[PDB]
Amino acid sequence: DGTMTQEDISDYVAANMKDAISRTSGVGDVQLFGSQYAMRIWMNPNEL
Amino acid sequence: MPNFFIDRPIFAWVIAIIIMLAGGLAILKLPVAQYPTIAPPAVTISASYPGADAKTVQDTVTQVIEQNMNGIDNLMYMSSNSDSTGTVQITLTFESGTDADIAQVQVQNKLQLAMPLLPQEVQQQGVSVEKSSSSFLMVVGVINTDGTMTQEDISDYVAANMKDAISRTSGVGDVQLFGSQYAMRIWMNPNELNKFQLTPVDVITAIKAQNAQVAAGQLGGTPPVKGQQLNASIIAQTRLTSTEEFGKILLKVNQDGSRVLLRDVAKIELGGENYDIIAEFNGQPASGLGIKLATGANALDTAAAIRAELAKMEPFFPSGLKIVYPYDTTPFVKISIHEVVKTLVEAIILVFLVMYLFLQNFRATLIPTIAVPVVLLGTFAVLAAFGFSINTLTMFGMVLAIGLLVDDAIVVVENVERVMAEEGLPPKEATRKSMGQIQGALVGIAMVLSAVFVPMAFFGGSTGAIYRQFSITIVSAMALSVLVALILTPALCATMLKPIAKGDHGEGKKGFFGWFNRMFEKSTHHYTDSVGGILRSTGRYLVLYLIIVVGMAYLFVRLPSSFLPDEDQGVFMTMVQLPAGATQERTQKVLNEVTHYYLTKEKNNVESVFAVNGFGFAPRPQNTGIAFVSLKDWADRPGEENKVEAITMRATRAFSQIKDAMVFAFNLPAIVELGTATGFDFELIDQAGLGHEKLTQARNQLLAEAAKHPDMLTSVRPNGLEDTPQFKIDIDQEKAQALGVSINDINTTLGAAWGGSYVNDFIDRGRVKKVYVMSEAKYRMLPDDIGDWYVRAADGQMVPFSAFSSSRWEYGSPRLERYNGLPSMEILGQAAPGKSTGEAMELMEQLASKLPTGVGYDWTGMSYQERLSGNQAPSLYAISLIVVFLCLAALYESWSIPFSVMLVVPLGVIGALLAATFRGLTNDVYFQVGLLTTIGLSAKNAILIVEFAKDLMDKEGKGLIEATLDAVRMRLRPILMTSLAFILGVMPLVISTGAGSGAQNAVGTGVMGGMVTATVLAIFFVPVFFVVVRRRFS
Ligand SMILES: CCCCCCCCCCCCO[C@@H]1O[C@H](CO)[C@@H](O[C@H]2O[C@H](CO)[C@@H](O)[C@H](O)[C@H]2O)[C@H](O)[C@H]1O
Ligand SMILES: CCCCCCCCCCCCO[C@@H]1O[C@H](CO)[C@@H](O[C@H]2O[C@H](CO)[C@@H](O)[C@H](O)[C@H]2O)[C@H](O)[C@H]1O
Ligand SMILES: CCCCCCCCCCCCO[C@@H]1O[C@H](CO)[C@@H](O[C@H]2O[C@H](CO)[C@@H](O)[C@H](O)[C@H]2O)[C@H](O)[C@H]1O
Ligand SMILES: CCCCCCCCCCCCO[C@@H]1O[C@H](CO)[C@@H](O[C@H]2O[C@H](CO)[C@@H](O)[C@H](O)[C@H]2O)[C@H](O)[C@H]1O
Ligand SMILES: CCCCCCCCCCCC
Ligand SMILES: CCCCCCCCCCCC
Ligand SMILES: CCCCCCCCCC
Ligand SMILES: CCCCCCCCCC
Ligand SMILES: CCCCCC
Ligand SMILES: CCCCCC
């Protein structure tokens, strides 16, 4: 329905899906094809 | 083999003695337990954040560890609590049969990745990983009978001298101190700190600087100069050892040269690390050790190892200090097992007497009496080989086995006596002849009977291991019984039996035996004359048999079904739960009332009460208490009203009157890790980051809807705590920046004063212990005390907290729960009378679907195994029924004749159901295994009746009726000999009182009831079955 980007989907998988899958019976290592959200502080050196 | 050992009786004896030798050695070495290990391994991660609220703990520790718990094999689920006591506990529960060592290693491997991310205060408190039961194996209480040591003194001694050695003992998974080890307590005064222009930061800095252990090297240390003669260690600062030394710590030298010592700004005493846990023993000041059994470790061996370690310590105790034993779960195991061992001996003695009534000579009576213990002892050696333990179920396997063992021996002995009486052959000839005509059937019967007991060794999960104990014990005994019946029993029959003349049935004897022999010989004629008349009617007994089968069916569905009875184990516990925010003083007030009740209203039943303030199943300061109750011996508590169930019922009823307190006494179950018969364990999940407040509303919505269905659901309540008022304080960053006050100084001053701060270690009488700084009680009691604490700015001005802070009252969780890494709220409850747990759960699912968006659920603990698998009974007993038929078909070389034997099953079931029904017992494990035993003997009796009849028809060429009448006539004596011996042998169990009588009563009742109907009905019905079946099929 085009309401979530690559980044939104990646965060949701990382925050609500990955951990439960990683603890599922018979599951070894789990690789996320994306990144969970962090609070990004993008600094401007001129303003600093 | 018989013919070999008839000529070599000393060989036969040697084999029997070696079997008993192996059994005796097995008994001395075999592990002893109440039940086999069926509880899933649980690894618990415990962490502590001093002075932290529930949310701080969760969001800096719990969530960080939980997110690192991955790549962990055989994990069923993960649950965690984050308390406002500054504590988190994450329990990872693993699949049954998981290696607890690897489970711990894997959890520990993942924890070490999370460790560097955890706060430094949490790391320094220690983050333990343990593999133990949730419940206590025992409590080791310590008191001072001379009253020379306070609760605090005893707690410190136990911590410093006893706890460590007990913690390192093999089998001890966890040790809980009921009290605190001493720490150097620096009780800070804010008025004095402000006077000398100092803060908790200055105090902490001064302690770290002046309570230091300095590595200073050596004089003439390597590499040295040429010609060095002196070499000595340089000793600089060492740890302080006393309040005096901490007291004279120099904080600052004033401008006029005067000194500010730590004792000038703080009270310095040797006090506890915490002041949360306070224990009493029968009202007296006490400490102790709450010991938990390591996963899979033997309870009795661990208990013995603990007592051995305590025995080492006692000689070096101070005057008056004494060990008391207020709670132990092991004595009952020891005594209950020993009560079953006693009924084995009693059963063998009663077997001997019933044998002497029929054989009427001492030597002959010993042949069946020797066979039983030889096989039973042998069975212990087979359990040892297969890695089984001596437990309640394996021990009751031995008791039920006796019936099958004596029958094997009696069948052999009686048949020799019958041959000797009919022909007049000497013992040695009659033995050879007798063995020749039954040795085939004995081997064949054991394979038919194995098809009855083997199937229930293939039950799955929790129930599986329970039934597997009986299967292997009984099947092993039967196998040895046949091997003993082919080696020893024949050898003894040839050497020990007295020659009987042809036609002599002991009717010529004078005395009791003279009369009994003539009574039985007449009774045998009355019997055959009765059967002879029954065989003419036939049809009216087929219809009477259908009445017994329908009678059985009705009783089976009416009889309530359970699993394992609740045993009185001479101990129980009482929970004291006040609402969160309730003080330590309020909880002691309620604990006193509970202690008072047991010491006054239950003098005759209760021996000791060990009450702990600020403890439940784990530490929980102020609002929680627990009481460990030890009862007097079962012998001194006669009747039902003096047993644990009635005592805890009366206690719970009395304590219901207590205001602002959930106080109840509870008997800890059979399998503690099964829970209760019709209880459910429900988890409400936050699936969409809704938050605590929204999840509470969803929980309240579910509890309100569950309250409208008392027809289905009963006592549906939260397992956690309710939100409580909390003092929200806001540090104004701009104002703190403006006054030149650092946020690190603010946070340290607030945390250290109001929460306490673990600075460093010191040496108290040779032992490393903690140094804590904190506010003196009186300056951290009132909200207005906040403003009495001053922080020094960069310019040197002392600034009160009131200058740079604002505060308000708000509500928040004292205990935040998470399930499988998501915020959760555990909801307990049970099915209403007459309703199954499945229906109760099915409705809870229905109600849970109606909750707001983002609220899911899950089942945990007792409700987890419930839903995954339940009731596979018809499947295994259908195969059993088929395989028994096939085995009988092979034995008789007939597809039809097996039915004549299989139609006896209901004759023993009706009597068991009647017995259990009319004693108010339930269709449980002990009833089921006792019923399979009853079916075994009754079927075995029928097999030998049908075998003797078919033999006379095939070999001697007799008619159907004549042969059937000859069969039952010949098989009467041995059937009754066995029936009486076993029925009378299980008498001690039926009338049993004392430790484990619940299990004994349950076993004996079903067997005695089943045996009497099976005995009286079979002797009249088996001859009908054979005659009727033989006629329908040519
Ligand atoms: C047919 C030829 C093969 C023959 C087989 C010979 C080997 C079998 C015997 C060796 C196994 C028995 O091993 C033995 O076990 C018994 C218990 O059962 C122990 O017996 C002893 O234990 C402790 C000492 O540890 C004593 O205080 C105690 O009085 C005694 O019961 C012995 O300490 C142990 O050495
Ligand atoms: C005749 C039919 C057979 C009847 C059933 C056989 C008896 C079954 C007993 C079950 C309980 C046995 O439990 C077992 O007892 C023996 C002693 O007897 C103990 O063995 C003991 O040996 C010696 C005996 O003096 C002690 O010094 C020692 O402390 C201890 O090791 C085992 O540590 C215990 O596990
Ligand atoms: C997965 C493994 C598969 C194998 C399963 C095998 C299970 C079947 C076991 C059934 C038990 C049969 O038991 C066996 O019956 C035969 C019947 O001929 C008896 O055999 C006896 O029967 C009569 C005697 O009048 C004679 O025909 C025969 O010469 C004699 O040996 C054996 O003495 C008995 O031991
Ligand atoms: C609800 C279940 C009740 C369980 C009862 C189980 C059986 C009870 C013990 C067996 C007693 C039966 O008693 C026995 O009955 C048969 C048939 O009626 C009698 O048989 C008698 O009557 C029949 C027909 O009337 C004649 O063909 C026969 O010649 C004559 O002897 C026996 O003389 C008697 O000894
Ligand atoms: C430990 C059991 C000892 C049993 C001794 C039996 C004696 C049998 C005597 C045989 C003489 C031929
Ligand atoms: C857990 C699945 C059941 C496995 C247990 C099988 C036990 C074998 C019985 C041996 C019969 C003598
Ligand atoms: C201590 C572990 C269990 C020991 C096995 C039993 C030995 C049997 C000796 C015949
Ligand atoms: C599974 C048992 C099969 C029974 C065989 C039927 C025999 C019929 C022979 C006429
Ligand atoms: C066989 C041990 C128990 C002793 C009698 C109470
Ligand atoms: C475990 C289901 C009930 C058992 C009936 C014998």
Side-chain angles (χ1 to χ4, degrees):
Chain A
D1 74 353
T3 58
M4 298 171 68
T5 56
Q6 201 281 334
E7 297 96 322
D8 283 327
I9 298 164
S10 285
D11 177 59
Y12 186 83
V13 171
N16 306 264
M17 300 186 72
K18 175 150 180 282
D19 283 1
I21 294 293
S22 71
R23 287 195 280 277
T24 303
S25 58
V27 169
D29 180 55
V30 173
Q31 175 70 45
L32 181 69
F33 296 125
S35 188
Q36 193 184 230
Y37 276 153
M39 186 55 57
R40 299 307 311 213
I41 314 301
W42 299 114
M43 299 181 294
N44 185 330
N46 301 344
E47 293 290 318
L48 271 167
Chain B
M1 273 207 281
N3 288 353
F4 180 80
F5 288 112
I6 286 156
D7 288 321
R8 281 150 276 247
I10 291 171
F11 204 144
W13 269 112
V14 157
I15 285 167
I17 292 161
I18 285 161
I19 284 165
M20 289 189 276
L21 237 295
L25 290 162
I27 286 154
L28 291 165
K29 282 308 226 294
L30 269 169
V32 183
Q34 190 187 3
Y35 300 118
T37 284
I38 65 173
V43 179
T44 300
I45 310 162
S46 299
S48 177
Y49 200 161
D53 62 289
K55 210 220 200 308
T56 295
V57 169
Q58 193 195 230
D59 291 5
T60 64
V61 183
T62 318
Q63 281 207 58
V64 177
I65 296 169
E66 278 187 342
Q67 283 177 16
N68 279 284
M69 294 300 105
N70 42 50
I72 290 162
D73 295 315
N74 312 124
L75 187 67
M76 293 198 303
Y77 48 80
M78 180 179 64
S79 60
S80 68
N81 319 301
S82 302
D83 293 50
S84 282
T85 64
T87 290
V88 57
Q89 277 198 318
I90 307 153
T91 311
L92 292 93
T93 312
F94 293 81
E95 298 284 1
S96 285
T98 300
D99 194 340
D101 293 338
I102 300 303
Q104 175 171 47
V105 160
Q106 284 184 2
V107 165
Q108 196 103 49
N109 188 51
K110 299 304 156 164
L111 179 69
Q112 272 181 49
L113 295 179
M115 272 301 307
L117 296 162
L118 297 184
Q120 212 76 45
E121 290 86 355
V122 174
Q123 300 192 28
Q124 285 175 357
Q125 280 304 317
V127 186
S128 66
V129 179
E130 293 178 321
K131 40 166 191 78
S132 73
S133 313
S134 50
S135 69
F136 287 112
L137 171 70
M138 57 171 69
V139 175
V140 179
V142 183
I143 59 168
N144 200 307
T145 55
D146 299 336
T148 322
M149 297 170 74
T150 59
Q151 174 271 132
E152 298 93 334
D153 283 325
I154 301 163
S155 298
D156 176 53
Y157 183 84
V158 168
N161 296 272
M162 303 181 67
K163 181 159 177 288
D164 283 6
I166 300 297
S167 303
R168 293 197 308 272
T169 305
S170 195
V172 175
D174 182 40
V175 183
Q176 204 83 46
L177 180 66
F178 295 127
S180 191
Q181 178 164 241
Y182 278 164
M184 186 57 56
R185 297 314 307 234
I186 311 301
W187 300 116
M188 295 185 295
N189 182 326
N191 304 336
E192 291 174 335
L193 273 172
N194 183 26
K195 174 178 178 172
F196 301 116
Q197 306 177 6
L198 297 165
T199 67
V201 179
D202 295 304
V203 164
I204 290 159
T205 299
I207 292 165
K208 281 178 174 169
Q210 295 183 49
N211 179 38
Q213 191 78 42
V214 172
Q218 291 176 6
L219 298 161
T222 61
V225 307
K226 250 208 175 290
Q228 185 69 10
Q229 298 295 338
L230 165 62
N231 176 222
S233 307
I234 300 177
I235 314 297
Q237 262 164 297
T238 63
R239 298 299 202 184
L240 308 187
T241 63
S242 59
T243 53
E244 182 189 313
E245 283 179 337
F246 275 98
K248 70 176 186 190
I249 288 175
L250 184 64
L251 296 171
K252 87 190 282 192
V253 175
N254 290 325
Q255 310 264 43
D256 68 327
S258 68
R259 295 163 229 89
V260 181
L261 307 186
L262 186 59
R263 70 176 180 244
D264 294 321
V265 303
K267 269 158 209 191
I268 299 164
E269 88 185 39
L270 202 59
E273 292 177 357
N274 72 77
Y275 290 77
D276 294 324
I277 301 137
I278 304 157
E280 277 185 21
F281 177 79
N282 297 340
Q284 304 172 33
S287 194
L289 296 177
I291 300 163
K292 305 200 174 169
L293 188 56
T295 304
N298 190 258
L300 281 168
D301 293 354
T302 309
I306 291 155
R307 277 173 178 279
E309 192 60 53
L310 289 170
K312 276 196 192 174
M313 296 165 179
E314 273 172 306
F316 311 101
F317 281 172
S319 62
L321 199 83
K322 195 196 184 182
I323 295 169
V324 292
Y325 301 95
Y327 190 82
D328 208 335
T329 59
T330 63
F332 168 79
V333 183
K334 215 170 198 79
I335 295 159
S336 62
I337 291 288
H338 282 197
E339 286 286 5
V340 184
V341 168
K342 168 160 144 188
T343 55
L344 280 178
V345 173
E346 282 177 318
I348 295 162
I349 295 162
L350 290 158
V351 156
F352 174 97
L353 291 185
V354 171
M355 290 298 95
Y356 188 74
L357 176 58
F358 282 98
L359 293 171
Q360 305 181 339
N361 81 75
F362 180 70
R363 265 152 47 205
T365 297
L366 288 182
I367 300 165
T369 310
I370 288 157
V372 167
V374 160
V375 170
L376 284 183
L377 281 163
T379 307
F380 282 96
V382 175
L383 291 181
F386 283 17
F388 284 70
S389 69
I390 295 161
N391 59 63
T392 309
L393 311 172
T394 54
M395 277 306 300
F396 275 128
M398 302 285 178
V399 178
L400 289 178
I402 283 167
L404 300 160
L405 306 194
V406 293
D407 196 60
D408 272 320
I410 285 160
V411 162
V412 171
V413 169
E414 187 281 329
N415 203 62
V416 167
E417 295 267 296
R418 192 220 71 214
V419 163
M420 278 204 294
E422 279 183 23
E423 297 181 45
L425 290 160
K428 187 154 262 171
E429 274 64 45
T431 294
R432 284 200 220 279
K433 198 192 192 283
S434 177
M435 293 315 304
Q437 71 184 55
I438 64 101
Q439 71 179 127
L442 286 196
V443 171
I445 288 156
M447 281 162 207
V448 171
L449 291 176
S450 66
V452 160
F453 294 106
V454 161
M456 83 178 154
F458 292 88
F459 272 115
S462 315
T463 63
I466 298 306
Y467 288 104
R468 186 151 38 253
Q469 298 308 288
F470 284 101
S471 301
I472 303 317
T473 300
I474 285 164
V475 161
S476 293
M478 281 197 295
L480 272 165
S481 192
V482 168
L483 208 73
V484 159
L486 292 173
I487 296 176
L488 183 71
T489 306
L492 299 201
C493 281
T495 56
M496 294 178 76
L497 287 184
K498 220 189 171 191
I500 302 173
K502 172 164 184 174
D504 183 33
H505 297 154
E507 286 184 296
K509 281 190 168 87
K510 187 174 177 179
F512 175 78
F513 291 146
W515 166 85
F516 182 83
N517 287 329
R518 291 193 309 274
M519 180 263 176
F520 198 88
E521 277 303 317
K522 268 149 204 189
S523 297
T524 310
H525 281 111
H526 288 169
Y527 170 64
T528 56
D529 285 336
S530 189
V531 178
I534 288 167
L535 295 177
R536 285 159 212 161
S537 182
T538 298
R540 270 178 253 113
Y541 291 83
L542 293 194
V543 179
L544 181 63
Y545 174 77
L546 298 172
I547 282 167
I548 286 167
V549 163
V550 168
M552 179 195 73
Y554 168 61
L555 285 180
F556 190 90
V557 297
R558 198 191 108 100
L559 187 64
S561 76
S562 80
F563 185 56
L564 281 172
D566 275 34
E567 290 292 352
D568 185 323
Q569 297 189 326
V571 288
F572 70 89
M573 285 172 289
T574 307
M575 187 59 50
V576 171
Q577 251 286 352
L578 307 202
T583 59
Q584 186 175 60
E585 186 164 339
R586 260 287 316 286
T587 297
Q588 191 58 53
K589 196 264 197 208
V590 173
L591 280 168
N592 287 350
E593 285 179 41
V594 169
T595 306
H596 179 270
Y597 172 79
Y598 291 129
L599 289 177
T600 58
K601 267 96 165 185
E602 289 287 353
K603 286 183 208 81
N604 298 334
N605 291 333
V606 172
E607 181 61 48
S608 59
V609 181
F610 192 93
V612 184
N613 191 340
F615 201 90
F617 305 122
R620 180 45 216 190
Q622 294 227 57
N623 80 303
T624 314
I626 189 164
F628 300 88
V629 188
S630 183
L631 296 170
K632 303 193 183 281
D633 193 64
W634 293 269
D636 302 306
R637 303 190 285 106
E640 167 166 325
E641 78 279 17
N642 293 315
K643 296 295 192 280
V644 165
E645 197 189 15
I647 291 169
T648 56
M649 221 107 70
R650 283 199 303 278
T652 299
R653 188 161 207 74
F655 299 146
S656 71
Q657 296 295 80
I658 299 169
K659 280 172 268 180
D660 305 26
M662 192 177 160
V663 181
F664 56 99
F666 52 98
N667 181 22
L668 208 69
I671 309 297
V672 175
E673 298 91 356
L674 273 183
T676 56
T678 50
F680 63 75
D681 194 350
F682 183 96
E683 292 289 353
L684 205 67
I685 314 294
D686 181 4
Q687 305 269 15
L690 294 171
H692 171 72
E693 283 68 32
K694 297 209 182 164
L695 180 56
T696 307
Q697 289 171 16
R699 182 210 61 178
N700 292 347
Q701 187 174 325
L702 175 57
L703 293 174
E705 293 294 319
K708 301 168 189 197
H709 297 78
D711 62 316
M712 271 284 177
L713 304 171
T714 301
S715 302
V716 185
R717 76 276 188 188
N719 195 34
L721 302 170
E722 305 306 316
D723 295 15
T724 57
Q726 53 189 39
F727 186 83
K728 177 68 203 198
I729 173 159
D730 288 328
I731 306 305
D732 201 73
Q733 294 287 329
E734 185 175 352
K735 189 61 186 191
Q737 272 178 28
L739 295 172
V741 175
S742 81
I743 304 298
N744 283 324
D745 284 5
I746 292 173
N747 292 343
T748 301
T749 298
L750 183 60
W754 291 83
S757 178
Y758 170 27
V759 176
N760 61 0
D761 295 326
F762 84 112
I763 311 300
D764 187 42
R765 291 113 70 194
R767 184 177 169 81
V768 175
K769 295 188 195 185
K770 301 193 173 62
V771 181
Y772 277 98
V773 309
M774 199 174 183
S775 178
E776 196 199 324
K778 69 198 305 185
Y779 309 104
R780 48 163 180 91
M781 290 296 109
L782 299 178
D784 282 357
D785 293 337
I786 293 285
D788 295 344
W789 288 92
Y790 289 73
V791 180
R792 196 176 55 256
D795 69 358
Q797 294 196 70
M798 301 306 295
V799 179
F801 247 83
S802 62
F804 53 75
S805 79
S806 58
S807 54
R808 53 163 188 281
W809 294 109
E810 65 172 28
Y811 276 78
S813 188
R815 187 174 180 278
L816 286 167
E817 314 161 37
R818 306 180 72 81
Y819 193 80
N820 288 333
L822 298 178
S824 60
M825 274 164 206
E826 194 178 14
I827 301 172
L828 303 177
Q830 57 197 15
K835 310 271 156 154
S836 64
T837 315
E839 286 183 306
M841 290 172 74
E842 181 171 332
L843 179 65
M844 285 290 289
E845 293 185 10
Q846 269 160 22
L847 297 169
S849 66
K850 302 277 167 158
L851 297 180
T853 302
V855 173
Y857 73 96
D858 203 349
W859 296 105
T860 192
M862 68 189 89
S863 297
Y864 190 84
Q865 294 179 334
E866 168 66 34
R867 60 178 277 199
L868 182 56
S869 288
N871 183 57
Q872 70 219 252
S875 286
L876 286 178
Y877 285 123
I879 290 154
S880 187
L881 208 63
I882 288 158
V883 173
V884 161
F885 168 82
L886 293 170
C887 287
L888 285 170
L891 174 81
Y892 294 125
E893 190 53 33
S894 180
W895 295 118
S896 58
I897 291 176
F899 294 127
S900 69
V901 163
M902 291 181 80
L903 279 167
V904 310
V905 162
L907 304 190
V909 179
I910 190 73
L913 284 169
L914 283 167
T917 291
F918 277 97
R919 185 151 187 188
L921 294 175
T922 55
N923 181 8
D924 65 335
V925 164
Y926 292 120
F927 178 85
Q928 275 147 41
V929 297
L931 184 56
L932 290 188
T933 308
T934 292
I935 290 161
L937 282 176
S938 69
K940 176 162 186 198
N941 294 344
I943 285 161
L944 286 169
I945 285 162
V946 167
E947 189 77 300
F948 271 51
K950 195 181 159 292
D951 186 294
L952 287 172
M953 288 181 72
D954 286 348
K955 287 173 161 267
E956 314 308 326
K958 303 282 209 76
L960 172 62
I961 304 289
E962 176 177 4
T964 304
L965 285 163
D966 282 20
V968 297
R969 187 205 89 243
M970 288 163 84
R971 294 316 310 165
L972 182 76
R973 184 152 138 268
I975 282 169
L976 298 184
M977 278 181 76
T978 300
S979 294
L980 281 149
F982 191 49
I983 287 163
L984 202 58
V986 302
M987 269 274 183
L989 300 172
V990 163
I991 65 102
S992 183
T993 62
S997 59
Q1000 290 191 40
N1001 290 336
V1003 163
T1005 297
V1007 163
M1008 184 178 282
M1011 281 302 291
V1012 299
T1013 48
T1015 303
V1016 304
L1017 293 171
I1019 59 167
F1020 296 117
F1021 268 109
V1022 168
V1024 176
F1025 296 148
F1026 184 71
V1027 166
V1028 168
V1029 158
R1030 278 322 305 267
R1031 284 186 168 169
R1032 167 69 89 148
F1033 307 98
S1034 284

